[PDB]
Amino acid sequence: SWDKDVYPEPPRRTPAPSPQTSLPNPITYLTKAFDLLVDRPVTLVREFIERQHAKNKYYYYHREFRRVPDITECHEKDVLCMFEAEMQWKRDYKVDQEIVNIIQERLKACQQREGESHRQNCAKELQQFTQVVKAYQDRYHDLGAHYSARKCLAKQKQRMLAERKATKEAA
Amino acid sequence: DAPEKNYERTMAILQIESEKAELRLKELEVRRLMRAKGDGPWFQYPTIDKALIDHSPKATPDN
């Protein structure tokens, strides 16, 4: 399974079967045949394999990188500090890429799930998508194939000079 | 290799190569200054050895 907060789903409301006709639908008989002939042997094989897993339990770990100093507090041409800052920046860029991927998965799952009323019922996922794509674009777009933390810092300083000039001229 | 090993090996490589680069830049600047001024151990082109001079009293006095 997964975490139901990073991948949220609304509660499922299925309607009760209310048959109006006297004809038996084939879907219930095929569902019973799928439960007997397919689902129970698959379940028994998986219970066997799960017992064999439980006989020898062992663990793996999610690697925790501590925060090293970033590129702003590295002296110029100091490769030992700015190497670590560059590696930290590359890891954070890869993680931001996967954050955008998570929010896109939420948007697409909402569009399939809400169906024909998807446009009204997926405004929150669309708004989160717009915010995270604006943040990703301000942070990483137009850096080029030879991106670094220096290119990203120069882009941020250009954007902050533009924002400071726009704040100054509007006051 | 572990990522720790490659990471710290990369740091050792970067330190060695940055030190070599700084020494090459200092070597260029040292060569420029010693060729310009002539006061270092390099670019010492020969002059006449003063130990070849005879300092004896000569045949005439005014010398």
- The answer to whether A87 contacts B7, with C-beta atoms less than 8 Å apart, is yes
Residues of B in contact with A80 (CB under 8 A): 11, 14-15, 18
Q: Is the dihedral of CA A62, A63, A69, A72 positive or negative?
A: negative
- The answer to whether A79 contacts B14, with C-beta atoms less than 8 Å apart, is yes
Residue whose entry in the numeric block shows the structure tokens 């915010």: A131
Task: Tell which residue, A89, A96, A92, has the closest CA to residue A151.
Answer: A89
Q: Determine the Cα angle at A11 with ends A10 and A17, to 5°.
A: 130
- The radius of gyration of chain A from alpha carbons, rounded to an integer in Å, stands at 26
Task: Tell which residue, A89, A96, A104, A86, has the closest CA to residue A135.
Answer: A96
Q: Which residues neighbour A132 within 8 Å (Cβ) at sequence distance 6 or greater? A: A99, A100, A103
Selected for mutation to probe chain B from A63, A65, A68, A83 (highest B CB count within 10 Å) is A83
Residue whose entry in the numeric block shows the structure tokens 């674009």: A137
- The answer to whether B18 contacts A79, with C-beta atoms less than 8 Å apart, is yes
- The rounded Cα A135 to chain-centroid distance in angstroms is 15
Q: Is the dihedral of CA B15, B21, B22, B27 positive or negative?
A: positive
SS (H, E, C) A103-145: HHHHHHHHHHHHHHHHHHHCHHHHHHHHHHHHHHHHHHCCCCC
CA distances in angstroms from A96 to A91, A100, A101, A109, listed in the order given? 9, 6, 9, 20
Q: Rounded to whole angstroms, how far apart are CA atoms A24 and A129? A: 45
Structure tokens at A128: 């989160």
CB atoms within 10 A of CB A69: 12
Task: Tell which residue, B19, B23, B7, A115, has the closest CA to residue B31.
Answer: B23
Q: Rounded to whole angstroms, how far apart are CA atoms A38 and A69? A: 56
Least Cα separation, residue A78 to chain B (angstroms): 9
Task: Tell which residue, B10, B20, B3, has the closest CA to residue A83.
Answer: B10
Selected for mutation to probe chain B from A63, A77, A79 (highest B CB count within 10 Å) is A79
CA distances in angstroms from A88 to A65, A79, A138, listed in the order given? 9, 14, 19
Q: Which residue of A has its CA nearest to B17?
A: A79
Q: Rounded to whole angstroms, how far apart are CA atoms A102 and A106? A: 6
- The answer to whether A80 contacts B14, with C-beta atoms less than 8 Å apart, is yes
**Local structure of residue A158 (DSSP, 8 states):** H
Residue A61 phi/psi, 5-degree rounding, is: -130, 150
Q: Number of residue pairs across A and B with CB atoms under 8 Å?
A: 13
Residues of A in contact with B21 (CB under 8 A): none
Residues 59-78 of A with CB under 8 A from B: 77
Least Cα separation, residue A92 to chain B (angstroms): 17
- Three-state DSSP class for A55? helix
Q: Rounded to whole angstroms, how far apart are CA atoms A13 and A50? A: 31
Q: Are A89 and A71 in contact (CB under 8 A)?
A: yes
Q: Rounded to whole angstroms, how far apart are CA atoms A99 and A92? A: 10
Q: Are A128 and A103 in contact (CB under 8 A)?
A: yes
**Local structure of residue A39 (DSSP, 8 states):** I
